[PDB]
Amino acid sequence: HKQKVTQELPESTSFDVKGIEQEATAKPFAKDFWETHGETLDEYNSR
Amino acid sequence: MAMEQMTKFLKESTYTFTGDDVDGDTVGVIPKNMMQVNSDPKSWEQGRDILEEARKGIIASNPWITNKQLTMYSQGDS
Amino acid sequence: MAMEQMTKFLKESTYTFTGDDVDGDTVGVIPKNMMQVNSDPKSWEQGRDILEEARKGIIASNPWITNKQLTMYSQGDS
C-alpha cells in the first residue's frame, strides 16, 4: 500500500509590507545656524 | 539647570505669534525650523513675513469670526 | 543618623562636576570609583583632570549648544 503522506510541507509567508521610510533627525536649529553661518545664535544677536 | 536649558532651547528654536488685543498677547507657537523657505536657517525670518501677511489676509476676508482673531498651530509638517 | 551616614558615604565616594554659570553650580555627579586610572584610589584625582580637559575640549569644539554647557552622567561603567 502506498503511503498517503508526502514530505511536501505547507508554506506560510511573512506579513512583509514596506511603506515609506522616514527622514533622518534633521539638525538642531542651533547647529544648523552654526555650520551655515559660522557663528552661533548668541553671537548673531549681539549685533 | 534643566529649566534654564529647556528655556534656552525653546527660545533659540521657536517663535511666538501675536495679533491684536488678545489676553496674554500670544496666539500659537511655531518652531523656527518649520518656517524656513531656503536651506539656510536664517531664512525662517522670511518665512515669517508670509504668515503675518497670510493670517491678516484671512482676517481681512473672514471677519465674521468671534473676534477678528485666529489661532496658530504646527503639527507634524504643517 | 541615617541621613548623616548616607551623606558621609556619598561625600567620601562621589564628586560633583561644575562648569560656567549654571543655576545650582552642579552638572552631573560621578563616583570617585569610576574615575581612577590606577589601582590606588587616590588616582581618581588624576582621572578627574582629563574629564575637565575633555568636557571643555568638547565645548571648544561644539559651541553651537544651547548654552556652552554639557551634562554628565555615569551609568554602569561609563
JSON list of C-alpha atoms in Angstrom, two decimals:
[
{"chain": "A", "resi": 1, "resn": "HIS", "atom": "CA", "xyz": [0.00, 0.00, 0.00]},
{"chain": "A", "resi": 2, "resn": "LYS", "atom": "CA", "xyz": [1.21, 3.48, -0.87]},
{"chain": "A", "resi": 3, "resn": "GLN", "atom": "CA", "xyz": [1.88, 5.87, 1.99]},
{"chain": "A", "resi": 4, "resn": "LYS", "atom": "CA", "xyz": [-0.69, 8.67, 1.76]},
{"chain": "A", "resi": 5, "resn": "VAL", "atom": "CA", "xyz": [1.57, 11.23, 3.48]},
{"chain": "A", "resi": 6, "resn": "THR", "atom": "CA", "xyz": [4.07, 13.24, 1.45]},
{"chain": "A", "resi": 7, "resn": "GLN", "atom": "CA", "xyz": [7.19, 15.02, 2.69]},
{"chain": "A", "resi": 8, "resn": "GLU", "atom": "CA", "xyz": [5.70, 18.10, 0.98]},
{"chain": "A", "resi": 9, "resn": "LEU", "atom": "CA", "xyz": [5.22, 20.75, 3.63]},
{"chain": "A", "resi": 10, "resn": "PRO", "atom": "CA", "xyz": [2.81, 23.68, 3.96]},
{"chain": "A", "resi": 11, "resn": "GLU", "atom": "CA", "xyz": [4.06, 27.21, 3.45]},
{"chain": "A", "resi": 12, "resn": "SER", "atom": "CA", "xyz": [3.40, 30.36, 5.45]},
{"chain": "A", "resi": 13, "resn": "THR", "atom": "CA", "xyz": [4.69, 33.78, 4.46]},
{"chain": "A", "resi": 14, "resn": "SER", "atom": "CA", "xyz": [5.65, 36.87, 6.41]},
{"chain": "A", "resi": 15, "resn": "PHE", "atom": "CA", "xyz": [3.47, 39.99, 6.51]},
{"chain": "A", "resi": 16, "resn": "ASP", "atom": "CA", "xyz": [6.28, 41.98, 4.91]},
{"chain": "A", "resi": 17, "resn": "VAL", "atom": "CA", "xyz": [4.83, 45.37, 3.99]},
{"chain": "A", "resi": 18, "resn": "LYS", "atom": "CA", "xyz": [7.16, 48.26, 3.23]},
{"chain": "A", "resi": 19, "resn": "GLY", "atom": "CA", "xyz": [5.71, 51.74, 3.30]},
{"chain": "A", "resi": 20, "resn": "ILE", "atom": "CA", "xyz": [7.79, 54.91, 3.12]},
{"chain": "A", "resi": 21, "resn": "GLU", "atom": "CA", "xyz": [10.97, 55.48, 5.10]},
{"chain": "A", "resi": 22, "resn": "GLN", "atom": "CA", "xyz": [11.32, 58.44, 7.43]},
{"chain": "A", "resi": 23, "resn": "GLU", "atom": "CA", "xyz": [13.59, 61.45, 7.13]},
{"chain": "A", "resi": 24, "resn": "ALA", "atom": "CA", "xyz": [16.54, 61.33, 9.50]},
{"chain": "A", "resi": 25, "resn": "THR", "atom": "CA", "xyz": [16.78, 63.59, 12.54]},
{"chain": "A", "resi": 26, "resn": "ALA", "atom": "CA", "xyz": [17.24, 67.00, 10.94]},
{"chain": "A", "resi": 27, "resn": "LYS", "atom": "CA", "xyz": [19.93, 69.09, 12.55]},
{"chain": "A", "resi": 28, "resn": "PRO", "atom": "CA", "xyz": [19.05, 71.26, 15.56]},
{"chain": "A", "resi": 29, "resn": "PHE", "atom": "CA", "xyz": [18.33, 74.86, 14.61]},
{"chain": "A", "resi": 30, "resn": "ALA", "atom": "CA", "xyz": [21.35, 75.97, 16.64]},
{"chain": "A", "resi": 31, "resn": "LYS", "atom": "CA", "xyz": [23.75, 73.63, 14.84]},
{"chain": "A", "resi": 32, "resn": "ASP", "atom": "CA", "xyz": [22.02, 74.45, 11.56]},
{"chain": "A", "resi": 33, "resn": "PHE", "atom": "CA", "xyz": [22.90, 78.12, 12.01]},
{"chain": "A", "resi": 34, "resn": "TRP", "atom": "CA", "xyz": [26.39, 77.16, 13.10]},
{"chain": "A", "resi": 35, "resn": "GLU", "atom": "CA", "xyz": [27.76, 75.22, 10.14]},
{"chain": "A", "resi": 36, "resn": "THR", "atom": "CA", "xyz": [25.91, 77.55, 7.74]},
{"chain": "A", "resi": 37, "resn": "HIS", "atom": "CA", "xyz": [26.83, 80.99, 9.15]},
{"chain": "A", "resi": 38, "resn": "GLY", "atom": "CA", "xyz": [29.99, 80.08, 11.09]},
{"chain": "A", "resi": 39, "resn": "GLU", "atom": "CA", "xyz": [28.79, 81.70, 14.32]},
{"chain": "A", "resi": 40, "resn": "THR", "atom": "CA", "xyz": [26.31, 80.65, 16.98]},
{"chain": "A", "resi": 41, "resn": "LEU", "atom": "CA", "xyz": [22.92, 82.20, 17.66]},
{"chain": "A", "resi": 42, "resn": "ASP", "atom": "CA", "xyz": [24.14, 84.25, 20.63]},
{"chain": "A", "resi": 43, "resn": "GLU", "atom": "CA", "xyz": [26.96, 85.74, 18.56]},
{"chain": "A", "resi": 44, "resn": "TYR", "atom": "CA", "xyz": [24.49, 86.73, 15.84]},
{"chain": "A", "resi": 45, "resn": "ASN", "atom": "CA", "xyz": [22.07, 88.67, 18.06]},
{"chain": "A", "resi": 46, "resn": "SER", "atom": "CA", "xyz": [24.84, 90.70, 19.71]},
{"chain": "A", "resi": 47, "resn": "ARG", "atom": "CA", "xyz": [24.90, 92.88, 16.58]},
{"chain": "B", "resi": 1, "resn": "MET", "atom": "CA", "xyz": [19.74, 73.88, 35.22]},
{"chain": "B", "resi": 2, "resn": "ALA", "atom": "CA", "xyz": [17.08, 71.82, 33.44]},
{"chain": "B", "resi": 3, "resn": "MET", "atom": "CA", "xyz": [14.70, 74.78, 33.39]},
{"chain": "B", "resi": 4, "resn": "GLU", "atom": "CA", "xyz": [17.23, 77.23, 32.02]},
{"chain": "B", "resi": 5, "resn": "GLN", "atom": "CA", "xyz": [18.39, 74.76, 29.40]},
{"chain": "B", "resi": 6, "resn": "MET", "atom": "CA", "xyz": [14.97, 73.82, 28.05]},
{"chain": "B", "resi": 7, "resn": "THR", "atom": "CA", "xyz": [14.06, 77.53, 28.14]},
{"chain": "B", "resi": 8, "resn": "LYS", "atom": "CA", "xyz": [17.12, 78.46, 26.11]},
{"chain": "B", "resi": 9, "resn": "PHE", "atom": "CA", "xyz": [16.43, 75.63, 23.67]},
{"chain": "B", "resi": 10, "resn": "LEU", "atom": "CA", "xyz": [12.86, 76.77, 23.12]},
{"chain": "B", "resi": 11, "resn": "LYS", "atom": "CA", "xyz": [13.90, 80.42, 22.86]},
{"chain": "B", "resi": 12, "resn": "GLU", "atom": "CA", "xyz": [16.51, 79.80, 20.18]},
{"chain": "B", "resi": 13, "resn": "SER", "atom": "CA", "xyz": [14.31, 77.48, 18.10]},
{"chain": "B", "resi": 14, "resn": "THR", "atom": "CA", "xyz": [10.71, 78.65, 18.42]},
{"chain": "B", "resi": 15, "resn": "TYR", "atom": "CA", "xyz": [8.74, 81.85, 17.81]},
{"chain": "B", "resi": 16, "resn": "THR", "atom": "CA", "xyz": [5.51, 83.16, 19.31]},
{"chain": "B", "resi": 17, "resn": "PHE", "atom": "CA", "xyz": [2.94, 84.79, 17.07]},
{"chain": "B", "resi": 18, "resn": "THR", "atom": "CA", "xyz": [0.76, 87.67, 18.22]},
{"chain": "B", "resi": 19, "resn": "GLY", "atom": "CA", "xyz": [-2.03, 89.78, 16.78]},
{"chain": "B", "resi": 20, "resn": "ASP", "atom": "CA", "xyz": [-4.41, 92.46, 18.02]},
{"chain": "B", "resi": 21, "resn": "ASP", "atom": "CA", "xyz": [-5.52, 92.74, 21.65]},
{"chain": "B", "resi": 22, "resn": "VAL", "atom": "CA", "xyz": [-5.51, 89.17, 22.97]},
{"chain": "B", "resi": 23, "resn": "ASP", "atom": "CA", "xyz": [-5.26, 88.28, 26.65]},
{"chain": "B", "resi": 24, "resn": "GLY", "atom": "CA", "xyz": [-1.66, 87.18, 27.08]},
{"chain": "B", "resi": 25, "resn": "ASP", "atom": "CA", "xyz": [-0.56, 88.52, 23.66]},
{"chain": "B", "resi": 26, "resn": "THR", "atom": "CA", "xyz": [0.23, 85.06, 22.31]},
{"chain": "B", "resi": 27, "resn": "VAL", "atom": "CA", "xyz": [-1.59, 83.22, 19.53]},
{"chain": "B", "resi": 28, "resn": "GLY", "atom": "CA", "xyz": [0.24, 79.98, 18.78]},
{"chain": "B", "resi": 29, "resn": "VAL", "atom": "CA", "xyz": [3.88, 78.93, 18.85]},
{"chain": "B", "resi": 30, "resn": "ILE", "atom": "CA", "xyz": [5.66, 77.56, 15.76]},
{"chain": "B", "resi": 31, "resn": "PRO", "atom": "CA", "xyz": [9.28, 76.38, 15.61]},
{"chain": "B", "resi": 32, "resn": "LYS", "atom": "CA", "xyz": [11.77, 78.43, 13.61]},
{"chain": "B", "resi": 33, "resn": "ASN", "atom": "CA", "xyz": [12.58, 75.21, 11.75]},
{"chain": "B", "resi": 34, "resn": "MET", "atom": "CA", "xyz": [9.19, 74.72, 10.08]},
{"chain": "B", "resi": 35, "resn": "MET", "atom": "CA", "xyz": [9.13, 78.26, 8.74]},
{"chain": "B", "resi": 36, "resn": "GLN", "atom": "CA", "xyz": [12.23, 78.37, 6.54]},
{"chain": "B", "resi": 37, "resn": "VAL", "atom": "CA", "xyz": [11.96, 78.91, 2.81]},
{"chain": "B", "resi": 38, "resn": "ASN", "atom": "CA", "xyz": [15.58, 78.14, 1.87]},
{"chain": "B", "resi": 39, "resn": "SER", "atom": "CA", "xyz": [18.25, 75.77, 3.17]},
{"chain": "B", "resi": 40, "resn": "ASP", "atom": "CA", "xyz": [19.87, 78.31, 5.48]},
{"chain": "B", "resi": 41, "resn": "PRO", "atom": "CA", "xyz": [18.04, 78.64, 8.80]},
{"chain": "B", "resi": 42, "resn": "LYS", "atom": "CA", "xyz": [18.07, 82.44, 8.92]},
{"chain": "B", "resi": 43, "resn": "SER", "atom": "CA", "xyz": [15.56, 82.22, 6.06]},
{"chain": "B", "resi": 44, "resn": "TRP", "atom": "CA", "xyz": [12.95, 81.45, 8.74]},
{"chain": "B", "resi": 45, "resn": "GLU", "atom": "CA", "xyz": [12.62, 85.22, 9.11]},
{"chain": "B", "resi": 46, "resn": "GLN", "atom": "CA", "xyz": [11.42, 85.49, 5.52]},
{"chain": "B", "resi": 47, "resn": "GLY", "atom": "CA", "xyz": [9.02, 82.60, 6.02]},
{"chain": "B", "resi": 48, "resn": "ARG", "atom": "CA", "xyz": [7.63, 84.51, 8.98]},
{"chain": "B", "resi": 49, "resn": "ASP", "atom": "CA", "xyz": [6.51, 87.51, 6.93]},
{"chain": "B", "resi": 50, "resn": "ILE", "atom": "CA", "xyz": [4.25, 85.45, 4.65]},
{"chain": "B", "resi": 51, "resn": "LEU", "atom": "CA", "xyz": [2.43, 84.07, 7.68]},
{"chain": "B", "resi": 52, "resn": "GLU", "atom": "CA", "xyz": [1.88, 87.52, 9.16]},
{"chain": "B", "resi": 53, "resn": "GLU", "atom": "CA", "xyz": [0.62, 88.53, 5.72]},
{"chain": "B", "resi": 54, "resn": "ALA", "atom": "CA", "xyz": [-1.47, 85.36, 5.43]},
{"chain": "B", "resi": 55, "resn": "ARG", "atom": "CA", "xyz": [-3.12, 85.48, 8.86]},
{"chain": "B", "resi": 56, "resn": "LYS", "atom": "CA", "xyz": [-4.08, 89.12, 8.39]},
{"chain": "B", "resi": 57, "resn": "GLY", "atom": "CA", "xyz": [-5.08, 88.26, 4.83]},
{"chain": "B", "resi": 58, "resn": "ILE", "atom": "CA", "xyz": [-7.51, 85.72, 6.26]},
{"chain": "B", "resi": 59, "resn": "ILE", "atom": "CA", "xyz": [-8.87, 88.17, 8.84]},
{"chain": "B", "resi": 60, "resn": "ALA", "atom": "CA", "xyz": [-9.44, 90.68, 6.05]},
{"chain": "B", "resi": 61, "resn": "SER", "atom": "CA", "xyz": [-11.50, 88.01, 4.25]},
{"chain": "B", "resi": 62, "resn": "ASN", "atom": "CA", "xyz": [-13.15, 86.19, 7.19]},
{"chain": "B", "resi": 63, "resn": "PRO", "atom": "CA", "xyz": [-14.28, 89.00, 9.51]},
{"chain": "B", "resi": 64, "resn": "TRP", "atom": "CA", "xyz": [-17.34, 87.22, 10.89]},
{"chain": "B", "resi": 65, "resn": "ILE", "atom": "CA", "xyz": [-15.19, 85.41, 13.45]},
{"chain": "B", "resi": 66, "resn": "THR", "atom": "CA", "xyz": [-15.89, 85.70, 17.18]},
{"chain": "B", "resi": 67, "resn": "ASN", "atom": "CA", "xyz": [-13.02, 88.14, 17.49]},
{"chain": "B", "resi": 68, "resn": "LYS", "atom": "CA", "xyz": [-11.19, 89.26, 14.41]},
{"chain": "B", "resi": 69, "resn": "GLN", "atom": "CA", "xyz": [-8.65, 86.72, 15.62]},
{"chain": "B", "resi": 70, "resn": "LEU", "atom": "CA", "xyz": [-7.45, 83.25, 14.60]},
{"chain": "B", "resi": 71, "resn": "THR", "atom": "CA", "xyz": [-5.14, 80.73, 16.27]},
{"chain": "B", "resi": 72, "resn": "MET", "atom": "CA", "xyz": [-1.97, 79.01, 15.14]},
{"chain": "B", "resi": 73, "resn": "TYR", "atom": "CA", "xyz": [-0.56, 75.51, 15.41]},
{"chain": "B", "resi": 74, "resn": "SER", "atom": "CA", "xyz": [2.07, 73.35, 13.75]},
{"chain": "B", "resi": 75, "resn": "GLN", "atom": "CA", "xyz": [1.53, 69.59, 13.97]},
{"chain": "B", "resi": 76, "resn": "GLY", "atom": "CA", "xyz": [3.92, 67.44, 12.00]},
{"chain": "B", "resi": 77, "resn": "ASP", "atom": "CA", "xyz": [4.84, 69.30, 8.84]},
{"chain": "B", "resi": 78, "resn": "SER", "atom": "CA", "xyz": [2.09, 71.91, 8.59]},
{"chain": "C", "resi": 1, "resn": "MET", "atom": "CA", "xyz": [21.64, 59.02, 61.87]},
{"chain": "C", "resi": 2, "resn": "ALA", "atom": "CA", "xyz": [20.59, 57.56, 58.52]},
{"chain": "C", "resi": 3, "resn": "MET", "atom": "CA", "xyz": [20.80, 60.96, 56.86]},
{"chain": "C", "resi": 4, "resn": "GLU", "atom": "CA", "xyz": [24.24, 61.78, 58.22]},
{"chain": "C", "resi": 5, "resn": "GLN", "atom": "CA", "xyz": [25.55, 58.35, 57.32]},
{"chain": "C", "resi": 6, "resn": "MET", "atom": "CA", "xyz": [24.33, 58.27, 53.73]},
{"chain": "C", "resi": 7, "resn": "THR", "atom": "CA", "xyz": [25.55, 61.87, 53.37]},
{"chain": "C", "resi": 8, "resn": "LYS", "atom": "CA", "xyz": [29.01, 60.95, 54.62]},
{"chain": "C", "resi": 9, "resn": "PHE", "atom": "CA", "xyz": [29.08, 57.91, 52.34]},
{"chain": "C", "resi": 10, "resn": "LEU", "atom": "CA", "xyz": [28.19, 59.97, 49.29]},
{"chain": "C", "resi": 11, "resn": "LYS", "atom": "CA", "xyz": [30.63, 62.72, 50.25]},
{"chain": "C", "resi": 12, "resn": "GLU", "atom": "CA", "xyz": [33.59, 60.39, 50.61]},
{"chain": "C", "resi": 13, "resn": "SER", "atom": "CA", "xyz": [32.88, 58.43, 47.42]},
{"chain": "C", "resi": 14, "resn": "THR", "atom": "CA", "xyz": [31.36, 60.83, 44.87]},
{"chain": "C", "resi": 15, "resn": "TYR", "atom": "CA", "xyz": [32.30, 64.12, 43.22]},
{"chain": "C", "resi": 16, "resn": "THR", "atom": "CA", "xyz": [30.19, 66.89, 41.71]},
{"chain": "C", "resi": 17, "resn": "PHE", "atom": "CA", "xyz": [31.27, 68.48, 38.45]},
{"chain": "C", "resi": 18, "resn": "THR", "atom": "CA", "xyz": [30.70, 72.15, 37.68]},
{"chain": "C", "resi": 19, "resn": "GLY", "atom": "CA", "xyz": [31.30, 74.49, 34.78]},
{"chain": "C", "resi": 20, "resn": "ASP", "atom": "CA", "xyz": [30.46, 78.09, 33.89]},
{"chain": "C", "resi": 21, "resn": "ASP", "atom": "CA", "xyz": [27.42, 79.91, 35.27]},
{"chain": "C", "resi": 22, "resn": "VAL", "atom": "CA", "xyz": [24.79, 77.21, 35.78]},
{"chain": "C", "resi": 23, "resn": "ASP", "atom": "CA", "xyz": [21.85, 77.56, 38.16]},
{"chain": "C", "resi": 24, "resn": "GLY", "atom": "CA", "xyz": [22.86, 75.48, 41.17]},
{"chain": "C", "resi": 25, "resn": "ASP", "atom": "CA", "xyz": [26.51, 75.14, 40.04]},
{"chain": "C", "resi": 26, "resn": "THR", "atom": "CA", "xyz": [26.25, 71.39, 39.56]},
{"chain": "C", "resi": 27, "resn": "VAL", "atom": "CA", "xyz": [26.45, 69.49, 36.27]},
{"chain": "C", "resi": 28, "resn": "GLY", "atom": "CA", "xyz": [26.39, 65.77, 36.98]},
{"chain": "C", "resi": 29, "resn": "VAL", "atom": "CA", "xyz": [27.70, 63.60, 39.79]},
{"chain": "C", "resi": 30, "resn": "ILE", "atom": "CA", "xyz": [30.18, 60.75, 39.19]},
{"chain": "C", "resi": 31, "resn": "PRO", "atom": "CA", "xyz": [31.58, 58.41, 41.84]},
{"chain": "C", "resi": 32, "resn": "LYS", "atom": "CA", "xyz": [35.25, 58.68, 42.75]},
{"chain": "C", "resi": 33, "resn": "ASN", "atom": "CA", "xyz": [35.48, 54.96, 41.98]},
{"chain": "C", "resi": 34, "resn": "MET", "atom": "CA", "xyz": [34.72, 55.16, 38.25]},
{"chain": "C", "resi": 35, "resn": "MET", "atom": "CA", "xyz": [37.33, 57.85, 37.68]},
{"chain": "C", "resi": 36, "resn": "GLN", "atom": "CA", "xyz": [40.54, 56.14, 38.78]},
{"chain": "C", "resi": 37, "resn": "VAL", "atom": "CA", "xyz": [43.34, 55.48, 36.32]},
{"chain": "C", "resi": 38, "resn": "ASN", "atom": "CA", "xyz": [45.50, 53.22, 38.53]},
{"chain": "C", "resi": 39, "resn": "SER", "atom": "CA", "xyz": [44.80, 50.64, 41.22]},
{"chain": "C", "resi": 40, "resn": "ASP", "atom": "CA", "xyz": [45.17, 53.07, 44.13]},
{"chain": "C", "resi": 41, "resn": "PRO", "atom": "CA", "xyz": [42.01, 55.09, 44.75]},
{"chain": "C", "resi": 42, "resn": "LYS", "atom": "CA", "xyz": [43.74, 58.45, 45.16]},
{"chain": "C", "resi": 43, "resn": "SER", "atom": "CA", "xyz": [44.40, 58.20, 41.42]},
{"chain": "C", "resi": 44, "resn": "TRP", "atom": "CA", "xyz": [40.79, 59.31, 40.94]},
{"chain": "C", "resi": 45, "resn": "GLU", "atom": "CA", "xyz": [42.13, 62.85, 41.23]},
{"chain": "C", "resi": 46, "resn": "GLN", "atom": "CA", "xyz": [44.23, 62.33, 38.10]},
{"chain": "C", "resi": 47, "resn": "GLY", "atom": "CA", "xyz": [41.28, 60.80, 36.28]},
{"chain": "C", "resi": 48, "resn": "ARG", "atom": "CA", "xyz": [39.34, 63.93, 37.17]},
{"chain": "C", "resi": 49, "resn": "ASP", "atom": "CA", "xyz": [41.66, 66.28, 35.28]},
{"chain": "C", "resi": 50, "resn": "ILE", "atom": "CA", "xyz": [41.18, 64.51, 31.94]},
{"chain": "C", "resi": 51, "resn": "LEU", "atom": "CA", "xyz": [37.42, 64.94, 32.25]},
{"chain": "C", "resi": 52, "resn": "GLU", "atom": "CA", "xyz": [37.70, 68.64, 33.00]},
{"chain": "C", "resi": 53, "resn": "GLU", "atom": "CA", "xyz": [40.01, 68.84, 29.98]},
{"chain": "C", "resi": 54, "resn": "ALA", "atom": "CA", "xyz": [37.65, 66.69, 27.90]},
{"chain": "C", "resi": 55, "resn": "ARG", "atom": "CA", "xyz": [34.41, 68.50, 28.71]},
{"chain": "C", "resi": 56, "resn": "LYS", "atom": "CA", "xyz": [35.97, 71.87, 27.97]},
{"chain": "C", "resi": 57, "resn": "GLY", "atom": "CA", "xyz": [37.61, 70.29, 24.94]},
{"chain": "C", "resi": 58, "resn": "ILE", "atom": "CA", "xyz": [34.15, 69.39, 23.69]},
{"chain": "C", "resi": 59, "resn": "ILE", "atom": "CA", "xyz": [32.76, 72.86, 24.41]},
{"chain": "C", "resi": 60, "resn": "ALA", "atom": "CA", "xyz": [35.66, 74.34, 22.45]},
{"chain": "C", "resi": 61, "resn": "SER", "atom": "CA", "xyz": [34.64, 72.12, 19.51]},
{"chain": "C", "resi": 62, "resn": "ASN", "atom": "CA", "xyz": [30.82, 72.06, 19.87]},
{"chain": "C", "resi": 63, "resn": "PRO", "atom": "CA", "xyz": [29.91, 75.69, 20.64]},
{"chain": "C", "resi": 64, "resn": "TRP", "atom": "CA", "xyz": [26.51, 75.65, 18.92]},
{"chain": "C", "resi": 65, "resn": "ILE", "atom": "CA", "xyz": [24.92, 74.16, 22.04]},
{"chain": "C", "resi": 66, "resn": "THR", "atom": "CA", "xyz": [22.01, 75.88, 23.79]},
{"chain": "C", "resi": 67, "resn": "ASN", "atom": "CA", "xyz": [24.41, 77.13, 26.43]},
{"chain": "C", "resi": 68, "resn": "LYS", "atom": "CA", "xyz": [28.09, 76.45, 26.08]},
{"chain": "C", "resi": 69, "resn": "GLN", "atom": "CA", "xyz": [27.31, 73.74, 28.61]},
{"chain": "C", "resi": 70, "resn": "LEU", "atom": "CA", "xyz": [27.01, 69.94, 28.65]},
{"chain": "C", "resi": 71, "resn": "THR", "atom": "CA", "xyz": [25.81, 67.48, 31.27]},
{"chain": "C", "resi": 72, "resn": "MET", "atom": "CA", "xyz": [27.43, 64.49, 32.93]},
{"chain": "C", "resi": 73, "resn": "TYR", "atom": "CA", "xyz": [26.29, 61.02, 33.91]},
{"chain": "C", "resi": 74, "resn": "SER", "atom": "CA", "xyz": [27.81, 57.65, 34.79]},
{"chain": "C", "resi": 75, "resn": "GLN", "atom": "CA", "xyz": [25.59, 54.62, 34.18]},
{"chain": "C", "resi": 76, "resn": "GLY", "atom": "CA", "xyz": [27.21, 51.24, 34.68]},
{"chain": "C", "resi": 77, "resn": "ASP", "atom": "CA", "xyz": [30.84, 51.52, 33.62]},
{"chain": "C", "resi": 78, "resn": "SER", "atom": "CA", "xyz": [30.84, 54.68, 31.52]}
]
